[PDB]
Amino acid sequence: PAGSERDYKIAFAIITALAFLTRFWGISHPDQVVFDEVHFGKFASYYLQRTYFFDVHPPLGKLLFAFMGWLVGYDGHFHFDNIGDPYVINKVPYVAFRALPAILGSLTVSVVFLIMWESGYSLPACILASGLVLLDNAHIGQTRLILLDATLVFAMACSLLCYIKFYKLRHEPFSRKWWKWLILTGFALSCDISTKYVGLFAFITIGSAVCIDLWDLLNINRPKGALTLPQFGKHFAARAFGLIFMPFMFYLFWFQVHFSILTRSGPGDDFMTPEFQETLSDNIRKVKTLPFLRKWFELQRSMFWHNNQLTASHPYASLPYQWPFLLRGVSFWTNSETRQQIYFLGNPVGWWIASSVLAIYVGIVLADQFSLRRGIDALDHRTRSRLYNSTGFFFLAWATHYFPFFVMGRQLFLHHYLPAHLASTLVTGALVEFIFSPFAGQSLMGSWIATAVILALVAWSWWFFLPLTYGYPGMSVQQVLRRKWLGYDLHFA
Amino acid sequence: PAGSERDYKIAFAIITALAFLTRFWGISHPDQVVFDEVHFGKFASYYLQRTYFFDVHPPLGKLLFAFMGWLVGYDGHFHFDNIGDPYVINKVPYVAFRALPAILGSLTVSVVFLIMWESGYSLPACILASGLVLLDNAHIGQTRLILLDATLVFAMACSLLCYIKFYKLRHEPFSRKWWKWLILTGFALSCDISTKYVGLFAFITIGSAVCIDLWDLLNINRPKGALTLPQFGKHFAARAFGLIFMPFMFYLFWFQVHFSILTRSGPGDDFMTPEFQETLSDNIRKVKTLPFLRKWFELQRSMFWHNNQLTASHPYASLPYQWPFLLRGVSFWTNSETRQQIYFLGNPVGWWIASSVLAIYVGIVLADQFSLRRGIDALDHRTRSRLYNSTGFFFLAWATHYFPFFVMGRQLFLHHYLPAHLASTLVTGALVEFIFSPFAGQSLMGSWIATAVILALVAWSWWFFLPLTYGYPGMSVQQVLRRKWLGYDLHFA
Numbered sequence: 001p002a003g004s005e006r007d008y009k010i011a012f013a014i015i016t017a018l019a020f021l022t023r024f025w026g027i028s029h030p031d032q033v034v035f036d037e038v039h040f041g042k043f044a045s046y047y048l049q050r051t052y053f054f055d056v057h058p059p060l061g062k063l064l065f066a067f068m069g070w071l072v073g074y075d076g077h078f079h080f081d082n083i084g085d086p087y088v089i090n091k092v093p094y095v096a097f098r099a100l101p102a103i104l105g106s107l108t109v110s111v112v113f114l115i116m117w118e119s120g121y122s123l124p125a126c127i128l129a130s131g132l133v134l135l136d137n138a139h140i141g142q143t144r145l146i147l148l149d150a151t152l153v154f155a156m157a158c159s160l161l162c163y164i165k166f167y168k169l170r171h172e173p174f175s176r177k178w179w180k181w182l183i184l185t186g187f188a189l190s191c192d193i194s195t196k197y198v199g200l201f202a203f204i205t206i207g208s209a210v211c212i213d214l215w216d217l218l219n220i221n222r223p224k225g226a227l228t229l230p231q232f233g234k235h236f237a238a239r240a241f242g243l244i245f246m247p248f249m250f251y252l253f254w255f256q257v258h259f260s261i262l263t264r265s266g267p268g269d270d271f272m273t274p275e276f277q278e279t280l281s282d283n284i285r286k287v288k289t290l291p292f293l294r295k296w297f298e299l300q301r302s303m304f305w306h307n308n309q310l311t312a313s314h315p316y317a318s319l320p321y322q323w324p325f326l327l328r329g330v331s332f333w334t335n336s337e338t339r340q341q342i343y344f345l346g347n348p349v350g351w352w353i354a355s356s357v358l359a360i361y362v363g364i365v366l367a368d369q370f371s372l373r374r375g376i377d378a379l380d381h382r383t384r385s386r387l388y389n390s391t392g393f394f395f396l397a398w399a400t401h402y403f404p405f406f407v408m409g410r411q412l413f414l415h416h417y418l419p420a421h422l423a424s425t426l427v428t429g430a431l432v433e434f435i436f437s438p439f440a441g442q443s444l445m446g447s448w449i450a451t452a453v454i455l456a457l458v459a460w461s462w463w464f465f466l467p468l469t470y471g472y473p474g475m476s477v478q479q480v481l482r483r484k485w486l487g488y489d490l491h492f493a
Numbered sequence: 494p495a496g497s498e499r500d501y502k503i504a505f506a507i508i509t510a511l512a513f514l515t516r517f518w519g520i521s522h523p524d525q526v527v528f529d530e531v532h533f534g535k536f537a538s539y540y541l542q543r544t545y546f547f548d549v550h551p552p553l554g555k556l557l558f559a560f561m562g563w564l565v566g567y568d569g570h571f572h573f574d575n576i577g578d579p580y581v582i583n584k585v586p587y588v589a590f591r592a593l594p595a596i597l598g599s600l601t602v603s604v605v606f607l608i609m610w611e612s613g614y615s616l617p618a619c620i621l622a623s624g625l626v627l628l629d630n631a632h633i634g635q636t637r638l639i640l641l642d643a644t645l646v647f648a649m650a651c652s653l654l655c656y657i658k659f660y661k662l663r664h665e666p667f668s669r670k671w672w673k674w675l676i677l678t679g680f681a682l683s684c685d686i687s688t689k690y691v692g693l694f695a696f697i698t699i700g701s702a703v704c705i706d707l708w709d710l711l712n713i714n715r716p717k718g719a720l721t722l723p724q725f726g727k728h729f730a731a732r733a734f735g736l737i738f739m740p741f742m743f744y745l746f747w748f749q750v751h752f753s754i755l756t757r758s759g760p761g762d763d764f765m766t767p768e769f770q771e772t773l774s775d776n777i778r779k780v781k782t783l784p785f786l787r788k789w790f791e792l793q794r795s796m797f798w799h800n801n802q803l804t805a806s807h808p809y810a811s812l813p814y815q816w817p818f819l820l821r822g823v824s825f826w827t828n829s830e831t832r833q834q835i836y837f838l839g840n841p842v843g844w845w846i847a848s849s850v851l852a853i854y855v856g857i858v859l860a861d862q863f864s865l866r867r868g869i870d871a872l873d874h875r876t877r878s879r880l881y882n883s884t885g886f887f888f889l890a891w892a893t894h895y896f897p898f899f900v901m902g903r904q905l906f907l908h909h910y911l912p913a914h915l916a917s918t919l920v921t922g923a924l925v926e927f928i929f930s931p932f933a934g935q936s937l938m939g940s941w942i943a944t945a946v947i948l949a950l951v952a953w954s955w956w957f958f959l960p961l962t963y964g965y966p967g968m969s970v971q972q973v974l975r976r977k978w979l980g981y982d983l984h985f986a
């Protein structure tokens with residue numbers, strides 16, 4: 001083919017259209033309460049009736065679900081109670097609830113394409129990364145239900161894109177665009193941490209990327225001039241204000257909204273001290289008013305303590321070492337009359353290729369450093385910097401979203417690897433531009449064939465496991481056997 | 494005072510004498526089976542009657558206990574069964590069993606002094622490190638029982654000393670002394686890993702110290718000449734042979750001894766496949782012979798699998814974050830008639846000072862690097878290199894023996910921090926030579942007063958908690974209250 005801005009735009013539009021198609025196709029088929037739709041639907045409904053409740057997660061995801069429900073006009077009283085009850089016979093708009101994660105997943109694919117486009121890679125690399133995210137069964141299966149992991153993944157991708165936009169403005173510090181993208185990176189990180197607490201890992205990524213930059217900004221002998229200590233102080237203050245203080249303010253604002261919406265007694269009042277019982281205006285009596293900081297501190301301590309002790313066992317808990325190569329998958333919902341399972345797992349071909357390319361990138365960096373120690377360059381200036389500045393950045397994200405799961409010893413599931421795997425899909429694309437590289441990009445035919453073959457193979461693998469992702473077509477017993485690759489408990493054999 | 498080789502020798506002799514005094518004083522007082530003397534005494538006895546058994550730990554520690562028992566001549570049939578039965582009314586030499594860990598603890602204090610002496614520090618620094626190890630209640634309490642953690646700590650200290658000896662010979666590579674100390678470092682690491690599997694962490698330390706060295710040996714532009722690739726290949730081959738292959742050979746040799754000693758049926762035969770039942774010569778019948786590698790592989794796989802699933806709950810399991818500052822301690826043995834407890838905990842003053850000095854060293858390194866980035870040296874060549882080569886090495890050991898406990902999520906106890914705390918006692922001494930430094934060592938009076946004050950305070954703290962370490966003097970209820978500093982469950986209040 002060829003390469004031009006028009007081709008970039010055409011590819012981006014097609015990728016976004018196919019993302020919206022795949023995430024929304026058959027979104028209402030399970031039409032029943034599924035693996036963890038129970039809790040989050042309960043909390044979204046409690047938001048709608050303004051009755052107070054208690055949860056261990058930060059509120060923003062359930063606020064988004066409640067906003068989607070409120071937009072339709074549903075208030076109702078169908079607070080979910082058990083896995084396996086029909087939504088349609090209860091006059092509840094579950095499709096409206098499920099449309100938000102689908103929109104966020106489609107926007108996640110678009111943001112992946114935007115990250116690869118903004119970093120400066122060629123069209124085949126952006127297409128490959130966006131297609132690996134597009135044709136992934138785990139991302140599709142997570143953006144299908146009432147689950148707040150899609151919001152987490154979208155916020156992490158948005159933070160990566162915002163920081164890439166901001167870093168390219170390093171030549172015009174303290175300008176309007178500079179401050180705008182700094183604040184936007186902070187806001188994306190704030191949303192990421194206000195969805196789930198594991199979003200803190202994104203703060204590590206953008207943290208590390210900042211620190212290195214600050215180190216580069218602290219060198220007294222650097223090619224781009226030198227900064228006096230007050231100027232570096234201004235830079236550090238700007239980073240701290242835009243990346244630490246604004247995220248905390250947005251987090252606090254989301255709890256302020258949570259407290260303002262909930263002004264009625266409900267299930268979860270007893271977790272608070274009697275003054276908080278007094279301030280809920282127990283209805284369906286006198287009510288007091290407390291300062292916001294006191295209520296926030298009490299709720300935060302209680303939430304941390306309950307997350308420290310209130311753990312419910314699940315048979316499909318996984319360990320971090322099983323994630324990058326898909327050694328085991330989780331099952332969400334199944335009924336025996338139609339022989340339909342919704343067993344949640346990634347795309348085995350895509351995940352294996354992405355992890356293998358992670359290993360190849362590690363080996364390439366090691367070989368380049370070893371050759372440099374001998375005094376051999378072997379890399380152009382442009383191809384070195386990118387491989388350490390852009391691709392390395394992506395490899396940073398993966399690491400910062402994968403390794404911290406070994407330190408945590410509570411229950412973890414495969415979907416916890418969805419953010420990190422996202423970054424894995426980026427380096428892959430970069431490494432296809434790298435090894436098959438002859439603005440110099442004449443005869444991208446090599447990378448074009450590489451990405452075409454890899455994406456066709458991943459597409460075949462996604463087509464193979466598509467029923468298990470959707471659960472619409474009832475599959476025969478021998479067809480269930482064909483999906484038993486690495487010991488997947490499909491329980492229909 | 495003054496400084497000279499005679500003063501070094503006098504201090505070393507006094508430190509060793511006091512170590513042997515403190516570790517052996519009242520060694521037979523508990524005169525009863527205690528917290529984990531059960532299992533290890535059982536296995537040492539089974540070694541003595543040559544009856545086969547199964548354990549999850551590598552055999553070397555129980556081989557040492559069985560050798561100590563065999564030296565006296567005891568064979569008997571007193572395989573331990575429950576916590577809290579009298580040794581003396583059963584004609585068993587428990588004092589002989591307990592003398593080995595006491596000897597190893599005294600030698601550990603001596604080896605700490607030797608490490609500080611060989612590295613080049615002044616007398617007050619060596620005295621401070623050796624005294625912090627000497628006046629530590631946790632090290633004393635671990636080298637008191639039939640427990641194989643003292644062997645682990647002694648082997649780690651010996652590996653550190655052996656590698657310091659070897660590295661000083663870097664100017665005469667491939668000589669007899671060079672190879673001798675390389676093999677000795679490998680053998681010390683082999684003993685460390687053949688006692689308990691956590692000894693692998695020492696392989697990290699000496700691993701890292703080697704890697705940096707190899708990096709320095711790989712630089713094509715380095716002050717001390719340049720090595721062609723074959724010469725660096727010879728260096729890497731020597732490191733791999735002395736640090737990887739010899740340790741594995743010694744580990745295999747210890748299993749060979751274990752298999753040769755055990756040629757009778759016993760408790761633990763059923764964990765093996767029927768061929769291994771056939772090779773045990775079931776007595777108290779035909780017996781076959783298997784190749785050693787097959788038996789070793791079967792036993793190793795079974796041991797790993799049982800350690801992966803066979804966990805027994807304990808009420809005093811701790812987490813790594815509680816260790817450096819002694820937030821909680823474990824109780825081993827107690828009887829209510831004499832009001833005697835043997836609650837195991839470190840020396841709070843010594844541990845707090847050691848951890849605080851770890852933090853101070855981190856801050857000092859950070860400040861030095863930050864000042865260097867501005868282009869300010871602020872450190873002499875001699876004082877820089879030491880702080881990064883010797884003291885840093887010690888800080889490496891601590892890290893490599895502490896952080897890997899967060900990755901592991903099984904049950905961990907406070908004694909697991911005994912190796913790492915050892916390295917913490919080294920940096921402390923170094924930092925007392927560092928900050929109070931005016932061969933230039935005129936007027937060490939500052940460091941002399943510093944170490945005198947710190948060691949007097951630690952000695953008072955050790956005297957305060959000495960009954961809880963020994964359990965000989967029955968303490969009153971109000972005296973139990975005085976030891977309730979950071980919430981220690983003494984259960985005699």
Ligand SMILES: CC/C(C)=C\CC/C(C)=C\CC/C(C)=C\CC/C(C)=C\CC/C(C)=C/CC[C@H](C)CCOP(=O)(O)O[C@@H]1O[C@H](CO)[C@@H](O)[C@H](O)[C@@H]1O
Pocket residue numbers: 118119120163164165167168208209210212213361362363365366381382385387388389390392393395396
């Ligand atoms: C086990 C260890 C292993 C295997 C791997 C370790 C991980 C590794 C390798 C690295 C860790 C991560 C690293 C190093 C950095 C992450 C954070 C950083 C530094 C940045 C954040 C990412 C981020 C937005 C990077 C921005 C990159 C954008 C696309 C650059 C825009 O083009 P741009 O003009 O600057 O290119 C060049 O600009 C030069 C100007 O000077 C010029 O000279 C050249 O001609 C050329 O124009």
Ligand SMILES: CC/C(C)=C\CC/C(C)=C\CC/C(C)=C\CC/C(C)=C\CC/C(C)=C/CC[C@H](C)CCOP(=O)(O)O[C@@H]1O[C@H](CO)[C@@H](O)[C@H](O)[C@@H]1O
Pocket residue numbers: 611612613656657658660661701702703705706854855856858859874875878880881882883885886888889
């Ligand atoms: C969060 C991060 C923080 C806070 C800390 C990070 C950890 C840090 C700071 C460091 C990590 C560990 C490091 C850097 C190294 C560990 C392993 C290494 C390199 C060695 C193993 C330890 C080890 C046996 C070191 C041996 C040191 C012996 C005592 C040196 C003997 O005296 P010697 O003549 O060589 O001194 C000088 O020899 C020069 C010759 O050139 C000469 O010029 C000088 O005049 C002067 O005679």
Ligand SMILES: CC/C(C)=C\CC/C(C)=C\CC/C(C)=C\CC/C(C)=C\CC/C(C)=C\CC/C(C)=C\CC/C(C)=C/CC[C@H](C)CCOP(=O)(O)O
Pocket residue numbers: 056057190193196197198199200203204206207208210211239240243244247248249251307
């Ligand atoms: C001086 C700075 C330097 C050197 C350089 C500049 C660095 C820079 C400019 C930016 C990044 C700075 C860095 C490295 C960190 C900053 C983030 C931080 C510590 C705070 C800011 C984040 C916030 C706005 C709110 C944090 C919420 C609070 C209050 C607590 C959370 C507790 C968490 C998150 C517990 C994680 C486990 C979780 C329980 C598992 C369950 O999991 P789940 O809920 O999913 O089931």
Ligand SMILES: CC/C(C)=C\CC/C(C)=C\CC/C(C)=C\CC/C(C)=C\CC/C(C)=C\CC/C(C)=C\CC/C(C)=C/CC[C@H](C)CCOP(=O)(O)O
Pocket residue numbers: 549550686689690691692693696697699700701703704732733736737740741742744800
């Ligand atoms: C190429 C090399 C480079 C780059 C540079 C040169 C590096 C160099 C020269 C030296 C060091 C090399 C390094 C970094 C590692 C080498 C060690 C290694 C992996 C093997 C050698 C060690 C052996 C002789 C035997 C190992 C026993 C075996 C077979 C398995 C054990 C399993 C372990 C240990 C499981 C740890 C958890 C434990 C279960 C907790 C329970 O705990 P507990 O039992 O206490 O209750």
